[PDB]
Amino acid sequence: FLGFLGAAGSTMGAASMTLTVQARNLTVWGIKQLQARVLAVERYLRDQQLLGIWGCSGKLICCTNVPWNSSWSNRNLSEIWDNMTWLQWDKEISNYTQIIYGLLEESQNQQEKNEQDLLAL
Amino acid sequence: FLGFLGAAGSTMGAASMTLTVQARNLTVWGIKQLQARVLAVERYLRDQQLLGIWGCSGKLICCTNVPWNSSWSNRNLSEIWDNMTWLQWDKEISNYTQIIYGLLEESQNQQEKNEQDLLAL
Amino acid sequence: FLGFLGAAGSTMGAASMTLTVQARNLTVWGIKQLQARVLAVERYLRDQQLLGIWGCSGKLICCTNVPWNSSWSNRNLSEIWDNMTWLQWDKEISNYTQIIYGLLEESQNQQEKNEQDLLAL
Amino acid sequence: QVRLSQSGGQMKKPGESMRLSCRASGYEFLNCPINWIRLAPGRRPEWMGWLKPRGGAVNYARKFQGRVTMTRDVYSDTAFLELRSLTSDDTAVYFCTRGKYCTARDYYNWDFEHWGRGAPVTVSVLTQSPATLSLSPGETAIISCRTSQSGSLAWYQQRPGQAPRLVIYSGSTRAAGIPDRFSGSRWGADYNLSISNLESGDFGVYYCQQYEFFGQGTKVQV
Amino acid sequence: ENLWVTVYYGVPVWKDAETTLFCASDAKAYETEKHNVWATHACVPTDPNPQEIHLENVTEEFNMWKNNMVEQMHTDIISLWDQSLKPCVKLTPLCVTLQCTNVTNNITDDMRGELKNCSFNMTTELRDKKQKVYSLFYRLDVVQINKEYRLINCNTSAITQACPKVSFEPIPIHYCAPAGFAILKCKDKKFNGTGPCPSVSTVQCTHGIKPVVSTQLLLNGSLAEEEVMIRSENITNNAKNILVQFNTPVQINCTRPNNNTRKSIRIGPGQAFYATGDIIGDIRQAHCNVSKATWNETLGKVVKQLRKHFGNNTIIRFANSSGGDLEVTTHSFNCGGEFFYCNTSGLFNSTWISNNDSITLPCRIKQIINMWQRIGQAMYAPPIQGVIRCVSNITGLILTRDGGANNTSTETFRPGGGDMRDNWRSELYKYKVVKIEPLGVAPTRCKR
Amino acid sequence: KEYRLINCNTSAITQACPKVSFEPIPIHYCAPAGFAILKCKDKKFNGTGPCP
Amino acid sequence: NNITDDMRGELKNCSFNMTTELRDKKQKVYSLFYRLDVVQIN
Ligand SMILES: *[C@@H]1O[C@H](CO)[C@@H](O[C@@H]2O[C@H](CO)[C@@H](O[C@@H]3O[C@H](CO[C@H]4O[C@H](CO[C@H]5O[C@H](CO)[C@@H](O)[C@H](O)[C@@H]5O[C@H]5O[C@H](CO)[C@@H](O)[C@H](O)[C@@H]5O)[C@@H](O)[C@H](O[C@H]5O[C@H](CO)[C@@H](O)[C@H](O)[C@@H]5O[C@H]5O[C@H](CO)[C@@H](O)[C@H](O)[C@@H]5O)[C@@H]4O)[C@@H](O)[C@H](O[C@H]4O[C@H](CO)[C@@H](O)[C@H](O)[C@@H]4O[C@H]4O[C@H](CO)[C@@H](O)[C@H](O)[C@@H]4O[C@H]4O[C@H](CO)[C@@H](O)[C@H](O)[C@@H]4O)[C@@H]3O)[C@H](O)[C@H]2NC(C)=O)[C@H](O)[C@H]1NC(C)=O
Ligand SMILES: *[C@@H]1O[C@H](CO)[C@@H](O[C@@H]2O[C@H](CO)[C@@H](O[C@@H]3O[C@H](CO[C@H]4O[C@H](CO[C@H]5O[C@H](CO)[C@@H](O)[C@H](O)[C@@H]5O[C@H]5O[C@H](CO)[C@@H](O)[C@H](O)[C@@H]5O)[C@@H](O)[C@H](O[C@H]5O[C@H](CO)[C@@H](O)[C@H](O)[C@@H]5O[C@H]5O[C@H](CO)[C@@H](O)[C@H](O)[C@@H]5O)[C@@H]4O)[C@@H](O)[C@H](O[C@H]4O[C@H](CO)[C@@H](O)[C@H](O)[C@@H]4O[C@H]4O[C@H](CO)[C@@H](O)[C@H](O)[C@@H]4O[C@H]4O[C@H](CO)[C@@H](O)[C@H](O)[C@@H]4O)[C@@H]3O)[C@H](O)[C@H]2NC(C)=O)[C@H](O)[C@H]1NC(C)=O
Ligand SMILES: *[C@@H]1O[C@H](CO)[C@@H](O[C@@H]2O[C@H](CO)[C@@H](O[C@@H]3O[C@H](CO[C@H]4O[C@H](CO)[C@@H](O)[C@H](O)[C@@H]4O)[C@@H](O)[C@H](O[C@H]4O[C@H](CO)[C@@H](O)[C@H](O)[C@@H]4O)[C@@H]3O)[C@H](O)[C@H]2NC(C)=O)[C@H](O)[C@H]1NC(C)=O
Ligand SMILES: *[C@@H]1O[C@H](CO)[C@@H](O[C@@H]2O[C@H](CO)[C@@H](O[C@@H]3O[C@H](CO[C@H]4O[C@H](CO)[C@@H](O)[C@H](O)[C@@H]4O)[C@@H](O)[C@H](O[C@H]4O[C@H](CO)[C@@H](O)[C@H](O)[C@@H]4O)[C@@H]3O)[C@H](O)[C@H]2NC(C)=O)[C@H](O)[C@H]1NC(C)=O
Ligand SMILES: *[C@@H]1O[C@H](CO)[C@@H](O[C@@H]2O[C@H](CO)[C@@H](O[C@@H]3O[C@H](CO[C@H]4O[C@H](CO)[C@@H](O)[C@H](O)[C@@H]4O)[C@@H](O)[C@H](O[C@H]4O[C@H](CO)[C@@H](O)[C@H](O)[C@@H]4O)[C@@H]3O)[C@H](O)[C@H]2NC(C)=O)[C@H](O)[C@H]1NC(C)=O
Ligand SMILES: *[C@@H]1O[C@H](CO)[C@@H](O[C@@H]2O[C@H](CO)[C@@H](O[C@@H]3O[C@H](CO)[C@@H](O)[C@H](O[C@H]4O[C@H](CO)[C@@H](O)[C@H](O)[C@@H]4O)[C@@H]3O)[C@H](O)[C@H]2NC(C)=O)[C@H](O)[C@H]1NC(C)=O
Ligand SMILES: *[C@@H]1O[C@H](CO)[C@@H](O[C@@H]2O[C@H](CO)[C@@H](O[C@@H]3O[C@H](CO)[C@@H](O)[C@H](O[C@H]4O[C@H](CO)[C@@H](O)[C@H](O)[C@@H]4O)[C@@H]3O)[C@H](O)[C@H]2NC(C)=O)[C@H](O)[C@H]1NC(C)=O
Ligand SMILES: *[C@@H]1O[C@H](CO)[C@@H](O[C@@H]2O[C@H](CO)[C@@H](O)[C@H](O)[C@H]2NC(C)=O)[C@H](O)[C@H]1NC(C)=O
Ligand SMILES: *[C@@H]1O[C@H](CO)[C@@H](O)[C@H](O)[C@H]1NC(C)=O
Ligand SMILES: *[C@@H]1O[C@H](CO)[C@@H](O)[C@H](O)[C@H]1NC(C)=O
Ligand SMILES: *[C@@H]1O[C@H](CO)[C@@H](O)[C@H](O)[C@H]1NC(C)=O
Ligand SMILES: *[C@@H]1O[C@H](CO)[C@@H](O)[C@H](O)[C@H]1NC(C)=O
Ligand SMILES: *[C@@H]1O[C@H](CO)[C@@H](O)[C@H](O)[C@H]1NC(C)=O
């Protein structure tokens, strides 16, 4: 272990070795902490809601049936996990993040679980 | 897609095509929003807690081993999903909602997971 | 059913028959309740986060691949579930709770799901 | 730091009345009661009464009721005492005391960790043994006290011409500044105070205490 | 054969802790107009159906003397008293010289005036004109200097008038705990207030506890179940108060004979002071009656329980209060808005050795009070029209024992209870706060 | 002729600050998560009853 | 003090009226203030 955000400067594959550590910790002047610790759990549940609506719910890692479009910075498998950091990576895919999100939440668990609805009728 | 609450006036089967969209978005005068957004996540986690104690946890849809009592508005499969809205439906079953809830939370995951307890000893 | 905390004085095995009932319910002078009901959901999500990082996520019960060390009050299978209450039990294992927690969160889902990472590359 | 500042001593005549003051500082006045205890030479210590700074509530001893009056000034944190119809029996050194444990939540009155300097006034059970103890520096002094009621017992040390200092409370627990050389033990109704490796400062007179009752005292000299 | 760890969520596991409790009142308490009666308005309505669960086989240790609910309730009512007086009328320009005289009566001189007819200058709505108006005040409210008088609180603190809209009448209050926590209740016949409890039950909200401010006597208190109960943190300690709980309630009647007139003088512009006008009828003093028979039996039932802790064959004497502030020495309470202070030398005047009318007690009235040993806040209780009558239950005592006894082997008890936290300990002895930790791991032959 | 302020036997008085302005501002009222606001878009909705 | 005049006072011994606890009576009390705290008029 390297503590919180330990492998931030490490490759994404090596940064995958420390995923559980960063999710773990995450009268006036007394309200300063209240208004903040409320937004903290809202930022948490915003992330868990997104994690739930997708084909995930179960945290840490999960698979999805969405093909990677080449326009989203066409890199190779060994050129990503062994030659790039998450900070450097999120910077490139930042443009397409809002787009990918829409394809995970709508195209998947709305059509995938609906498969079972046709099997349930 | 038809946006939030899109298929409200559509049949329950057709309204099942838009389940993910409604779960996604869901000094004084500044406390007006705080006391409200606190009640929002309490209203959210109340639904997720109920969704967790039942044979669900995983959101959207899930199966249960509870037989539909005929006294609960005896309708046919094709007379429900293709001839009734969720608004029109919940109005009839409103009387038995509290009853069914007790059968999902107590009779199921308390006895169903206890099966594994006898298998674990 | 025996209501909230019903089988507290019953054996741990008999107390396993009532697990779902205790998880279900769980201008000044008006802030007295707000500051409290905020700590309530924080105490809840602290437990749900710990429940998520481990090999659980799904509530109530779950298995783990962690061997029971004999130094942790070496008792027998039949000497625990049929001769001890949860209150009496937690009092002995209280010394090793922080230790066990570290082995569930770190050694497991950080190495167990990482297995899939080597299978995903 | 907790400090009890007493007014000086005085000489009175029989029949007259006397008054003493005691200004507390270093803590919140309203938290815990103040006590008044008289010490006469070669006599069992007498607890007269206590006063709560709260509502000015008081509780005296049988012996003094109708003669004694305790009041206080919350604003100046000063406690007042009055005793009427003075007789030669009244002659003694009067102290104001405060318990050790004294928080906002609760307190324990009778572990007197804090003592005023005392006021010498002249007008003109617990079985403690031995009465006296002549020992050399380096030896070990064993003072004994037999009770009959049980309850947090304390040990005090009085140096020649100085105010008594809390040495031990609860029968086995040392107070602040007390070295390992002082130790307490208990067996049934019996209580033992053991002082190992005697030195100049240790010599004086020692008292055992159970609430408002005191022992007859044990004088340890060089 | 080798065991494996398994996580359980929702197990009956709790630990003693402290949290922020919220309030609860019955619906009818909101439904009654009340206008203002404490801060009960923001309070959550009580669950119509009571929910309780008897924990079989469970034995939990209680401690009424180390209970945090008492401290929280104390500060809650304290902050409540301030919030109830913040938007009220402040009486800063009422510290003018008072040219007072005796009230209209025919007195030998043993009545010692008590009531004073004060005349003084006052600020009207306009800045320019003075106002020569007269009022009526109790002797305990005024003090002469160097006949000219002044308000008794002038070198103490500032002063604010209680609003006529608000009421000090006690309301049943239920204290509840948030999610993740629970309140334990001892349901024993004879729980003397400390240690392990055989029959333990759980509750979300406690029963209706009326926050009655009183000293010495547990006025409008509550009863015990079998034999009268005696609770003390340390009985051998005479510095610790001894809280007594009765089985049968003692019927007492307190009245204010002086039918009064409210005079509404306007300090201005929108602020009005209420002054006592002239009395109509006879000049009599407030008093309280205690059924002699009921009190004799009740004392006789208590003295039989006191022997169980101070020896079977001993003498128990009752004597009045030794001294102190007027509120502690007398029986302090509220009735109909006015604050009475009654002489309890007629109740603790007994001597019990070897095991048809009412007892009346002289009662004084103060309008200027400073309870809870409040600093910087003095409240003036406005005059109340009509004869005030109140009938209540004495269900307990707060006694103190005299020390340095040794020789006689006898005990004398005097009324005390200066601190008001003891008044709450008489209702919260059965309740305590615990936190639920539903996460419990346990080994079994279960692997993936 | 001697006069006085009209509010003297009514109430106290406080002066509006010259910094502040009473000019109406467009205000949008919104609902938190879990709630929603319904809007009638009818040509002739006379203010009560069902909306098409 | 005993000052040549280069000390420029600095410290001032001011006397004034004051409101007591009672409304009616004025209070003639004196205090001490720094020159930077006070300013003379006319
Ligand atoms: C209400 O409620 C409440 C609650 O809920 C309650 O309360 C209560 O109260 C009471 C009164 O106050 C109390 O009682 C008390 O107690 C105490 C304590 O107890 C405990 O302990 C014990 C022991 O002790 C010890 O130890 C401990 C530990 O272990 C500690 O802590 C302590 O402190 C002590 O210590 C000491 O000692 C030691 C040695 O020993 C040393 O080391 C040290 O240092 C010190 O010194 C125990 O034991 C107990 O237990 C018991 O009991 C049970 C039942 O209960 C059982 O089961 C068990 O088993 C046991 O038994 C045993 O013992 C006995 C005796 O005791 C015997 O008999 C038998 O057989 C057996 O063996 C517990 O745990 C105590 O201490 C006390 O006692 C005392 O006192 C009495 C009177 O009061 C008497 O009677 C007795 O007898 C005793 O006396 C004695 O002792 C003392 C001292 O202590 C002295 O002073 C005297 O003199 C005498 O002496 C004798 O003895 C000795 C010994 O043996 C000898 O040596 C000599 O020589 C002589 O002989 C009391 O008891 C309680 O506790 C409470 N509880 C609670 C829970 O908290 C109430 O009550 C109610 N109320 C109503 C009305 O009901
Ligand atoms: C805006 O918007 C809004 C909303 O959105 C609107 O609102 C509106 O308003 C209006 C006005 O105001 C209204 O109207 C009215 O209404 C009423 C009610 O209605 C209902 O009901 C009915 C019945 O009635 C009854 O019943 C019920 C239950 O069932 C109840 O509730 C009631 O109250 C009543 O009761 C009564 O009676 C009974 C018997 O009957 C008894 O038992 C009791 O006791 C009492 O007495 C019903 O019917 C209706 O329905 C109807 O309609 C529908 C459509 O609409 C249809 O679909 C159906 O089917 C029906 O029809 C039927 O009927 C008719 C009649 O009515 C006929 O014709 C036909 O054919 C059929 O058969 C409903 O549901 C009412 O009442 C009224 O009426 C009346 O009035 C009027 C005027 O106003 C007239 O015209 C009429 O005619 C009538 O009259 C009559 O009657 C009366 C009484 O009532 C009288 O008085 C008179 O005289 C007359 O008489 C006659 O008749 C009778 C009977 O038959 C006889 O017997 C006799 O002899 C004679 O002949 C009115 O209509 C409404 O409602 C509302 N709506 C809502 C939603 O709300 C507004 O409008 C707007 N605006 C604008 C501008 O736009
Ligand atoms: C901060 O950033 C620096 C530089 O960017 C990182 O340093 C690099 O770390 C990586 C590991 O993640 C290194 O890659 C590995 O090097 C190992 C060591 O090389 C051995 O052999 C050479 C030659 O004899 C000697 O230096 C020495 O004897 C070493 O023992 C190799 O053993 C590794 O190969 C093995 O592991 C891989 C898996 O990683 C297997 O797939 C292989 O089959 C093989 O078994 C590997 O090559 C790299 O060399 C380091 N230097 C660089 C890149 O310049 C820090 O790790 C990084 N730190 C943090 C905290 O982020
Ligand atoms: C608001 O409410 C209105 C009325 O209640 C709804 O309108 C109904 O919509 C349903 C669909 O949900 C319609 O049902 C379907 O009609 C289709 C169209 O019919 C075709 O053929 C006729 C005759 O030639 C012509 O009108 C035209 O050529 C159409 O192309 C059918 O094709 C459908 O059948 C097929 O689909 C079903 C699945 O739904 C399959 O199971 C079948 O095997 C088949 O392949 C179907 O019958 C209905 O006709 C509409 N009108 C009514 C009920 O009066 C709105 O949809 C609704 N809107 C919202 C947003 O809620
Ligand atoms: C509070 O605490 C008390 C005591 O600690 C508990 O009482 C014990 O409860 C346990 C059950 O949890 C009892 O154990 C069971 O006793 C049953 C009754 O015994 C029968 O037979 C005897 C002899 O003829 C008679 O008394 C009577 O006819 C009874 O009908 C047995 O039937 C049980 O055996 C069966 O069940 C077990 C599973 O539990 C199976 O594995 C067996 O194969 C068998 O089929 C069992 O022995 C115990 O006897 C009670 N008394 C004690 C321990 O002294 C309370 O239950 C507890 N309450 C709460 C709410 O916690
Ligand atoms: C107004 O107040 C005055 C007070 O000055 C009062 O006059 C007083 O009346 C009392 C009696 O009511 C007088 O006291 C008397 O003293 C003599 C001795 O000097 C006694 O002998 C008298 O005893 C008789 O009266 C008692 C009263 O009931 C009986 O109980 C007893 O059996 C005897 O019959 C009595 O104690 C007092 O001297 C006068 N004082 C003066 C200055 O006159 C007056 O009555 C009051 N009037 C009203 C209308 O209130
Ligand atoms: C109170 O304040 C007065 C101020 O008026 C002060 O009297 C003054 O004393 C000073 C010296 O302390 C005098 O200054 C002198 O001026 C003459 C020229 O006129 C010089 O020759 C003097 O020089 C001698 O003294 C110096 C001071 O130490 C030496 O350093 C030098 O070597 C010389 O020996 C000196 O500068 C001033 O004239 C008077 N002023 C008046 C009005 O008398 C007085 O001393 C103060 N007293 C107290 C008790 O504070
Ligand atoms: C206190 O007052 C109550 C009523 O205000 C008294 O109760 C009354 O007792 C008489 C008997 O003398 C009955 O005739 C009445 O019917 C009772 N009234 C009620 C309302 O029950 C009580 O006796 C008084 N007690 C004391 C000590 O003064
Ligand atoms: C991939 O991205 C391009 C834009 O560069 C877009 O035209 C194309 O439709 C995308 N692929 C899919 C399957 O949508
Ligand atoms: C179904 O509902 C009826 C009431 O109409 C009830 O009597 C019956 O018990 C219910 N079925 C079951 C399985 O409980
Ligand atoms: C079990 O506990 C002992 C301490 O008693 C420790 O030495 C040992 O390493 C533990 N077992 C494992 C597998 O860590
Ligand atoms: C837990 O540890 C403490 C000291 O750290 C020890 O006193 C206690 O006995 C231990 N618990 C058990 C069940 O042995
Ligand atoms: C006094 O009470 C404390 C705690 O309430 C207890 O520890 C102590 O033993 C008691 N003393 C006596 C003499 O009972």
Author numbering:
A (entry chain B), B (entry chain K), C (entry chain C): 519 to 544, 569 to 663
D (entry chain I): 1 to 52, 52A, 53 to 82, 82A, 82B, 82C, 83 to 99, 99A, ...
E (entry chain A): 32 to 141, 150 to 185, 189 to 309, 312 to 321, 321A, 322 to 398, 411 to 503
F (entry chain J): 189 to 240
G (entry chain G): 136 to 141, 150 to 185
What does the paper say about this structure?
Many antibodies capable of neutralizing a large fraction of circulating HIV isolates, broadly neutralizing antibodies (bnAbs), have been isolated from HIV-infected individuals. VRC01-class bnAbs are attractive vaccine leads owing at least to their potency, breadth and protective capacity, and to the fact that their in vitro neutralization curves typically saturate at 100% viral neutralization, in contrast to some other bnAb classes (V2/Apex, PGT151, and 10E8) that fail to reach complete neutralization for some isolates, likely influenced by glycan heterogeneity. Thus, while the HIV Env trimer has evolved a glycan fence around the CD4 binding site that imposes steric and entropic penalties to antibody binding, VRC01-class bnAbs appear to have evolved solutions that avoid glycan clashes and partially offset the entropic penalties.
Glycans account for at least 30% of the surface area buried by NIH45-46 on the trimer; the antibody interacts with N197, N234, N276 and N462 glycans on one gp120 protomer and with the N262 glycan on the adjacent gp120 protomer. In the absence of the N276 glycan, the N234 glycan appears to have avoided trimming and makes extensive contacts to the NIH45-46 L-FW3 patch, effectively replacing the N276 glycan interactions with L-FW3 seen in the eOD+VRC01 complex. Based on our trimer structure, we estimate that NIH45-46 buries ~25% more area on the Env trimer than on core gp120, nearly half of which is due to additional protein contacts. Importantly, NIH45-46 recognizes the bridging sheet in its pre-fusion conformation on the BG505 SOSIP trimer, positioning the H-FW3 patch to interact with gp120 elements β21, β3 and the base of the V2 loop. Moreover, the N197 glycan, at the V2 base on the trimer, is in H-bonding distance to two affinity-matured NIH45-46 residues, namely ArgH19 (H-FW1) and ArgH82A (H-FW3).
